[PDB]
Copies of this chain bind each other. A is one copy, B any other.
Amino acid sequence: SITDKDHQKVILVGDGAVGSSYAYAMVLQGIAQEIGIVDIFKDKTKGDAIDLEDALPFTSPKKIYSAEYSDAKDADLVVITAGAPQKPGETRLDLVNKNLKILKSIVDPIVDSGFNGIFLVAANPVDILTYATWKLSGFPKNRVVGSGTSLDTARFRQSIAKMVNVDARSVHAYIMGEHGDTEFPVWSHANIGGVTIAEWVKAHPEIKEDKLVKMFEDVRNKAYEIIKLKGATFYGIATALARISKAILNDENAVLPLSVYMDGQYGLNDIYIGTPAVINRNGIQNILEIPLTDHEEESMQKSASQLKKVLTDAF
């Protein structure tokens, strides 16, 4: 039967707080039918798998288990989460190189298993590791996807939502560029129920320019704030990963801000970087090129340039 294929299988690589929280999100939302969890720390993955299985009688059924790279053979999705952290005083290039070795030891056995689905990359630095996964795997550009600025965009939406007291699902505003210190807000096309932020501020002049600038700064620094407060961030990114997973596995043609391959968009080439894109069961369909102001376009060029320099030195 053609309906022998109606079994969606996800292989998760990295079972830190991000990977674990992602698996839990997929369990609670009933997304996919099978999750294999791969990590060097085997005991932890078994522990997580059996803790997660106990949730199953209150949600939809799944097979969940501690897995190996060879289990990716018939997977739909390989989700790569756990980047080696930057050490005090280590360069960005050194961070990249140590992650490339590790990432090679994940991607090569996954490819060798016969895996032929979509790579979803969340490991930091995400735009760089998305590109690296593309280079290592040999896959088509549109089947290697990074989480990019999807989380920063959610943070930005929720911050605006709180300021104006509106459901963030009615707020539409992007953060773009390389996820990290060089990302920028796209204020020119940001809106609340279709009303641009510029228009909203005209109607509500108590909202000062200084507060909007600070709101974006606070978004850019949000991970640092959360890490300072509780040690690590995870609920945001796990949720954003589950959302991306659903867009793929339910073939949605949803627009999400993701790390996608530049082929001329924004005057950029041959890097992965954060922009809105349409995603479906076959990966990235269209890349949306928001017409940026001169100030926004310069931010995009600066973000990309430093990123491209690091990629060039790295490969």
Contact = CB atoms under 8 A, between A and B. Distances in A.
A311 interface: no
A46 B151 CA distance: 18
B288 A235 contact: no
A76 B3 contact: yes
Contact of A252 (B61, B162, B222, B228): B61
Contacts of A96: none
A291 interface: yes
Nearest to A48: B230
A220 interface: no
A305 B173 CA distance: 35
Given A24-B235, A161-B56, A239-B55, A194 B199 contact: no
A54 B152 CA distance: 9
A137 interface: no
Interface string A161-172: 110011111111
A195 interface: yes
A235 B8 CA distance: 22
Contacts of A59: 239
One complex includes copies of this chain to the number of 4
B194 A186 contact: yes
Interface stretch (A99-107, A128-136, A242-250): A242-250
Contacts of A226: 47, 50-51
A74 interface: yes
A253 interface: yes
A211 to B, nearest CB: 18
Contacts of A230: 43-44, 46-48, 51
Contacts of A174: 194
A251 B117 contact: no
24 contacts: A2-B116, A3-B249, A3-B282, A7-B281, A21-B24, A46-B230, A47-B226, A47-B231, A51-B226, A51-B230, A51-B235, A51-B236, A54-B154, A54-B222, A58-B239, A58-B242, A61-B168, A61-B169, A165-B278, A167-B252, A192-B288, A194-B276, A195-B291, A199-B290
Interface stretch (A28-36, A87-95, A266-274, A294-302): A28-36
Query: Which of A6, A47, A203 is the most central at the interface, judged by chain B CB atoms within 10 Å of its CB?
Result: A6
Contact of A192 (B8, B157, B255): B255
A158 interface: yes
A205 interface: no
A167 B28 contact: no
Given A2-B117, A194-B288, 13 more contacts: A3-B248, A6-B248, A28-B239, A47-B230, A50-B226, A50-B229, A51-B226, A54-B239, A56-B168, A57-B158, A172-B191, A189-B195, A191-B191
B61 A167 contact: yes
